[PDB]
Design a protein around this nucleic acid. Structure first.
Ligand SMILES: [Mg+2]
Ligand SMILES: [Zn+2]
Lengths: 52, 190, 134, 196, 161
RNA sequence: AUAUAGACAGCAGGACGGUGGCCAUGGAAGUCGGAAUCCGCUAAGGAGUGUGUAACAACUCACCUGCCGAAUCAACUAGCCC
């Protein structure tokens, strides 16, 4: 069992992030463009899917 | 476009002094001395007065990419001032669902042993960067305190600790176990 | 509070429903009305209006009385089966009549375009009954 | 639209300040729209209240100050989430009613609580299916007559600390009186006079 | 203690919600460690105990016996605090000096057990032997030879069947 | 296009009453859907851009306000580079 504040701290690094639709890169939650060249710094981003 | 001049000034507190050796900044304060050279950036560093100790960073005829470096240098120098005056303290929390994470701090805080991460028999030995001391907090039950003068060294040590306890071949959205940087602050709170 | 209270609202009306209605689903909240309660509530709630009829009930530990708030669309659909200005002028007399008001004309301005489901020319240039209610 | 809005607002402010000679400047804390409606209804009978943009306020009372002197001394004092209540009544009659009609605001999550409260040892009165929040917070509760009972006095909150989500929902379900605040008078202005 | 309280509270609330109340014929059915409807230990190593046994042994250290232990258990469990320095019970979370007091349940049940746990896991022979003598734990041959987790199982079985 | 009648970005609040608006209903209460877009409080509030709750609820947005005190934003277009 994990209490909610520690769960939020873990989720800040593990779940609250953006994923590039082209190259699956793990980006910070406020990202607008991917940081990686192989997708061409695309702006096709989606939220990381939740366990809910 | 080439901008004629881009400058930025950092104020220096009275208890700390700064010496320039070309583009090498030596910041001596109550807690120690932080020395860092910026020879990879073509800027001009100057100390202004004998009264309030302003440090000016100047870039002449720079395009956008090298105008971006002036505030980078200024922020680095401010971090050096902050480190030698108040220091840097990173508080990390170890979170776990079933297996408690046992952390043992070896000699002088320079080595960290993680024992029971996710119940595995492997022992994680993480060596701190020089000048960074790790300790087990007496205020919280699962808390590591990393204290030092260099923000990059302290944060690199914290990142090493965080990345050592990485869940593999499992859903990381479910297996949230590990040591994570809870907060970043200073020592002495002044 | 007599160990149980009936503050909760309902959104049933028109057809009796009973078993088809969600009143048995509310039932386990208070355990008092049950079928012998929702049937006798619907007996008085058959009309006023013949629509969804969002209404509140008050429990006397054996029987329930029902009060229907003067919802604009509810009362206008009850009225319906043209201007008909007087019926909407008189339908707002017995309501709560708060509407964050500053004058009596605000309520009739509200209901004139609540009837839009064109009743907007009156809203544009209305010059009648500004102080009729007070 | 925006320009006409601002022009109409300027006209409203200048006519209101010309009409009403006595006004109290009053700070707005974390207050709700329901409280705004309640104050509007409870005050619109005898006086009026004004709460808009501070830049609008200063510009209106500065640029068109030529119509009456003894007004520029408000300018270095109108700061923060503040507004003006315009009344023809007197200071005590406004102050006592405005200090009495304070809505008991609950414990919203993410809100600082300078005041201190402490839960006593008393029966909750609710069903025994809400022990999860008590156990998560660390509260010893036991079954008694089909209701949850607080067997020991515990420290709930201190002064000047953040409120967690579990504490906020506990105070929401407890149906007790938490720390509360509302529209509080900063100072007064009666024809060119500054007091408390 | 918090986990035990979580489980006891869960049992009480579940039976209260999903069954009849105290006004029913069965009466007060919600469990209480102070009454003796709650047990601890592990059946894997064959050792179990209730508040009754430790209350009985503490009354023995300090009809009549049953009446003593009946209201002794009421202090054995609960949100009560015993100060080892004071030597007497207290109902206040703050001591007159200022030191935080351990609760009675932990301080005078779980603490000797944690002493013997730490001793027998860290292989402190002097601590294990002295705790055996302080708790008059009876042991036989083929059980007085081992040390570690099997000795922990044996000592738990013999001291607390 | 916005901006000293104080922009933009950050940090902090309000984001309502009728109305848990009508026809959809077994809950859809602002968001599984069909129509229309009212009024007032005003600092603003869509009888709703999204998350979601069985459903409530609890969040977020566009809308305004507070701190902040000088410029900022958007959509395109075409050179080299990817
Ligand atoms: Mg797998
Ligand atoms: Zn990418």
């Amino acid at each position: 069992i994990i209490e909610p504040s520690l769960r939020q701290l873990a989720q800040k690094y593990n779940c609250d992030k953006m994923i590039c639709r082209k190259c699956y890169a793990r980006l910070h939650p406020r990202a607008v463009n991917c940081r990686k060249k192989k997708c061409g710094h695309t702006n096709n981003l989606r939220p990381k899917k939740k366990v809910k | 476009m080439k901008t004629i001049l881009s400058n930025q000034t950092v104020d220096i507190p009275e208890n700390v002094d700064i010496t320039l050796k070309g583009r090498t900044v030596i910041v001596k304060g109550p807690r120690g001395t932080l020395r860092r050279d910026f020879n990879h950036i073509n800027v001009e560093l100057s100390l202004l007065g004998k009264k309030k100790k302003r440090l000016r960073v100047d870039k002449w005829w720079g395009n956008r990419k090298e105008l971006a470096t002036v505030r980078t240098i200024c922020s680095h120098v401010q971090n050096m001032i902050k480190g030698v005056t108040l220091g840097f303290r990173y508080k990390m929390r170890s979170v776990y669902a079933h297996f408690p994470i046992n952390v043992v701090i070896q000699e002088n805080g320079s080595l960290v042993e993680i024992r029971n991460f996710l119940g595995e028999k492997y022992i994680r030995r993480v060596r701190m960067r020089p000048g960074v001391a790790c300790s087990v907090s007496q205020a919280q039950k699962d808390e590591l305190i990393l204290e030092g003068n260099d923000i990059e060294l302290v944060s690199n040590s914290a990142a090493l600790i965080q990345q050592a306890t990485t869940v593999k071949n499992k859903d990381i959205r479910k297996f949230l176990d590990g040591i994570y940087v809870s907060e970043k602050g200073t020592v002495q709170q002044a | 509070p007599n160990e149980i209270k009936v503050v909760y609202l309902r959104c049933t009306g028109g057809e009796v429903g009973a078993t088809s209605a969600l009143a048995p689903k509310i039932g386990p909240l208070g355990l008092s009305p049950k079928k012998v309660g929702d049937d006798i509530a619907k007996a008085t709630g058959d009309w006023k209006g013949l629509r969804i009829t969002v209404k509140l009930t008050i429990q006397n530990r054996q029987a329930q009385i029902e009060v229907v708030p003067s919802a604009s669309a509810l009362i206008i659909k009850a009225l319906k089966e043209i201007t008909f200005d007087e019926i909407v002028n008189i339908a707002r007399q017995m309501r709560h009549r708060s509407l964050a008001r500053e004058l009596s004309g605000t309520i009739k301005e509200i209901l004139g375009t609540a009837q839009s489901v064109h009743p907007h020319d009156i809203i544009d240039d209305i010059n009648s009954g500004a102080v009729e209610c007070p | 639209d925006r320009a006409t809005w601002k022009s109409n607002y300027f006209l409203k402010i200048i006519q209101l300040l010309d009409d009403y000679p006595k006004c109290f400047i009053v700070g707005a804390d974390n207050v709700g729209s329901k409280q705004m409606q309640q104050i509007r209804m409870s005050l619109r009978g005898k006086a009026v209240v004004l709460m808009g943009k501070n830049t609008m306020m200063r510009k209106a009372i500065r640029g068109h100050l030529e119509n009456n002197p003894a007004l520029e001394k408000l300018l270095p004092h109108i700061r923060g989430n503040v507004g003006f209540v315009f009344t023809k009544e007197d200071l005590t009659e406004i102050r006592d009613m405005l200090l009495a009609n304070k809505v008991p605001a609950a414990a919203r999550a993410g809100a600082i609580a300078p005041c201190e409260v402490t839960v006593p040892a008393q029966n909750t009165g609710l069903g025994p299916e809400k022990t999860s929040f008590f156990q998560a917070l660390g509260i010893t509760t036991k079954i008694s007559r089909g209701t949850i009972e607080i067997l020991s006095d515990v420290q709930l909150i201190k002064t000047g600390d953040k409120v967690g989500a579990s504490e906020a929902t506990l105070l929401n379900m407890l149906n007790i009186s938490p720390f509360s605040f509302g529209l509080v008078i900063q100072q007064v202005f009666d024809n060119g006079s500054i007091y408390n | 203690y918090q986990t035990f309280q979580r489980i006891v509270e869960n049992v009480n609330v579940i039976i209260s919600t999903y069954g009849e109340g105290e006004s029913g014929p069965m009466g007060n059915i919600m469990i209480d460690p102070v009454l003796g409807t709650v047990g601890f230990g592990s059946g894997l190593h064959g050792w179990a105990f209730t508040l009754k046994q430790f209350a009985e042994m503490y009354v023995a250290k300090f009809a009549e016996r049953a009446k003593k232990v009946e209201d002794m258990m009421k202090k054995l469990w609960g949100d009560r605090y015993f100060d080892p320095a004071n030597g007497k019970f207290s109902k206040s979370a703050t001591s007159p000096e200022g030191k935080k007091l351990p609760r009675t349940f932990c301080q005078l049940i779980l603490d000797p057990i944690f002493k013997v746990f730490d001793a027998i896991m860290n292989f402190k022979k002097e601590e294990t032997a002295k705790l055996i003598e302080k708790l008059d734990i009876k042991l036989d041959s083929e059980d007085k030879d081992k040390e570690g987790k099997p000795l922990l199982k044996a000592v738990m079985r013999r001291w607390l069947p």
